[PDB]
Structure prediction request, 442 residues.
Amino acid sequence: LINTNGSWHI
Amino acid sequence: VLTQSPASLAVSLGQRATISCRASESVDSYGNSFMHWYQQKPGQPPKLLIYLASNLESGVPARFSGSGSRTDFTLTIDPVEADDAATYYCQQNNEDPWTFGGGTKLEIKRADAAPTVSIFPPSSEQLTSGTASVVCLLNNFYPREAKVQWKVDNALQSGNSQESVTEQDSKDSTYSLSSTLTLSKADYEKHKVYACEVTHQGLSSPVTKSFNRG
Amino acid sequence: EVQLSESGPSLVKPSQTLSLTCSVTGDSITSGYWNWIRKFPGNKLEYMGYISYSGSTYYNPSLKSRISITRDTSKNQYYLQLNSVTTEDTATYYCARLYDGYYAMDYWGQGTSVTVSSASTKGPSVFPLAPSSKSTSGGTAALGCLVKDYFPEPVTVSWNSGALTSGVHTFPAVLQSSGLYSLSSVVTVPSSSLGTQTYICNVNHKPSNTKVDKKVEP
Prediction:
């Protein structure tokens, strides 16, 4: 799980 | 937005403490809750207690506990100890923006202690500067509420004193308070009696500490 | 021992730029997320942003106009810049690490106080609060140090260089009407030892590069 613009995605 | 409840709270040694964190919107995603708890004491950085809603950070006693739904979370300390006096924050990083809760200050409720009152005249060194600070110390009292009254030659003082209160001590749960009366050097040597009258629930009668110039 | 140390000016003039540095020792900023957080004097916390293991960044929206986070992996540091500061930006600033398994902020630095003001620095005058019959009750006597007329915050006080800690109370600072800060630090000691033992308070005001060692006698 990585975070982009304060949101976590996979 | 995160709203904590209550804003302050008091608990006896050995009872259960429950702090609440309210979320404006679901902070769940990917099977975890992105909600964490931090303890902070004055002069220190926040300290992680609970991560991912319910997981205990290592180093933290099992007395601390976390539990939470998508938008409702709760932090629990059982049994509370003297060392647990602090302010507790909840933080959310599920989605933009990452925000902290408003904070919850936990007070340890104990038996009444009477203050030990001391008075300090200005030093010789400060009188050469042209200012005189007379300080009144209330050491080791409980509860936190207290009233300090300044007398100069048995006259009420008003608008020339300030006070500051420590936060509750992590070993004996007491407070301490200083009051500082500030006069000019010219005014300080114009009077003889300087008195400090303390009113507090722990004292049967108000206690007056005083000295004569000389 | 993952460990973070902030550094930067204590006092900034309004509309200038705030430049803080977090020096990381005990693991690499090659991995993990590296954040900036500030605590206002009202004691509210506010997240500011991070730079990640890959160099991407994320910023609070209330800051986007003027915040910048960068890093230097060969020094193992990362950097805050906040342009055009006002008095609203007076706060204690922390840097902190966040990691993949935990997704929470697990290592903090001690924090660095920063004041935004057009006023200039001023070091404190340190006077003794000396023990007397009027400060002695039971087997115990109170004494301390008054730390007057300094700016900006903060001041720190120790006694006998940290070798005396029990019974020590350093009060929070009060803002006088002169715009300068003032506090006071007291300790209780056995009154018997007033004759033989030396009591020195160590006052530290880094913003003015001041250190006073004051010996408090009856």
Observations:
- Chain A touches chain C at residues 1, 3-6, 8 (CB under 8 Å).
- The CA atoms of residues 2 and 8 of chain A lie 6 Å apart.
- The two ends of chain A are 5 Å apart (CA to CA).
